[PDB]
Amino acid sequence: IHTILYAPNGQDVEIKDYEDPIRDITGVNGRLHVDCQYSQGRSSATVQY
């Protein structure tokens, strides 16, 4: 089971603070591109009630 992470810059989560000097605000923004996929779904069993 693969967690595929993508970033145009670097590899991990991209979290940045920035300042708006027109409004006197710090923004903190986070982004990430993610998907999750089995290579072999047969390799997992769910337990059901």
On the CB side of 19, how many CA atoms lie within 13 Å of its CA?
Answer: 2
Single residue of 10, 23, 41, 49 touching other proteins by CB under 8 A = 23
Closer CB to other proteins, residue 25 or residue 45? 25
The Cα–Cα gap between 32 and 17 comes to 15
How far is residue 6's CA from residue 33's CA, in Å, rounded to a whole number? 5
Answer for which of 3, 18, 22, 34 binds other proteins (CB under 8 A) is 22
Q: Tell the smallest beta-carbon distance from residue 28 to other proteins (Å).
A: 15
Under the binding rule (CB under 8 A), the answer on residue 17 touching other proteins is no
